[PDB]
Amino acid sequence: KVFGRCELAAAMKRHGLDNYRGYSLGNWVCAAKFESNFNTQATNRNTDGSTDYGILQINSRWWCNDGRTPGSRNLCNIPCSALLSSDITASVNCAKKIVSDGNGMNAWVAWRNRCKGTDVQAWIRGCRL
Numbered sequence: 001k002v003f004g005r006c007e008l009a010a011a012m013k014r015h016g017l018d019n020y021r022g023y024s025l026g027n028w029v030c031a032a033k034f035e036s037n038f039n040t041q042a043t044n045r046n047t048d049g050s051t052d053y054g055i056l057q058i059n060s061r062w063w064c065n066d067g068r069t070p071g072s073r074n075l076c077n078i079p080c081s082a083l084l085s086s087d088i089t090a091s092v093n094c095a096k097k098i099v100s101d102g103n104g105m106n107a108w109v110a111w112r113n114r115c116k117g118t119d120v121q122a123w124i125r126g127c128r129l
Contacts, residue, residue, distance in 0.1 A: 001039070001040045001041070001086035002038055002039045002040075003040070003055070005029065005033075005038065005123065005127070006124070006126065006128065006129075008029060008032060008038055008055070008088075009029050009123070009124045009127045009129060010127065010128070010129060011088050012025060012088070012092065013025055013129055015088060015089060015092040015093075016092070016096075017092055017095070017096070020096055020099065021096075021099045021100060021104060022104075023099065023104070023105055024120065024121070025123075025124050025129070026120035026121045026122065026123040026124045027105060027111065027115060027120045028095075029120075029123035030111065030118070031105065031108050031110065031111040032055045033123065034110040034111070034114045034115065035052075035055065035056050035057035035108060035110050035111075036054065036055045036056065036057055038055065039055070040083075040084055040085060040086055040088065040091075041054075042054060042055070042057065042084075043084070046059070049069060049070065050069045050072065051066055051068075051069070051080065053066075053080045053081075053083035054083030054084055054085075054090075054091045055091050056091050056094075056095050056108065057108070057110075058076070058080075058091065058094050058098065060072055060080050061073070062075055063075050063076045063094055063098060064076055064078050064079065064083060064094065065078070065079055065080060066079070066080040066081075076097055078090055078094065
């Protein structure tokens with residue numbers, strides 16, 4: 001599923017991501033924009049052999065099981081395929097674990113490089129929320 005901007009903002013809010021660990025909704029929408037362009041089915045293979053999955057491009061090295069990432073963990077206790085669903089519940093629950101891990105949203109390199117410090121409220125501007 002390719003979400004609309006405000007559509008995703010609303011789904012993220014419904015799933016309790018707004019201000020989670022102090023990160024406003026716009027931060028989450030911004031991260032999703034640059035990680036996946038709002039596409040739940042996004043995947044990307046990393047040089048180390050791991051793969052990133054879903055709207056927030058969660059990586060198989062630590063967070064989900066895809067059966068093809070040697071030496072990895074599955075800390076969210078989910079198949080990586082669950083991160084591709086039109087239903088964002090799995091991605092949101094896993095993102096909550098990730099953002100609690102110690103480095104906040106810096107875990108998402110694209111958030112650090114493209115969202116951090118910017119006017120992220122613009123990502124939810126206009127939205128009915």
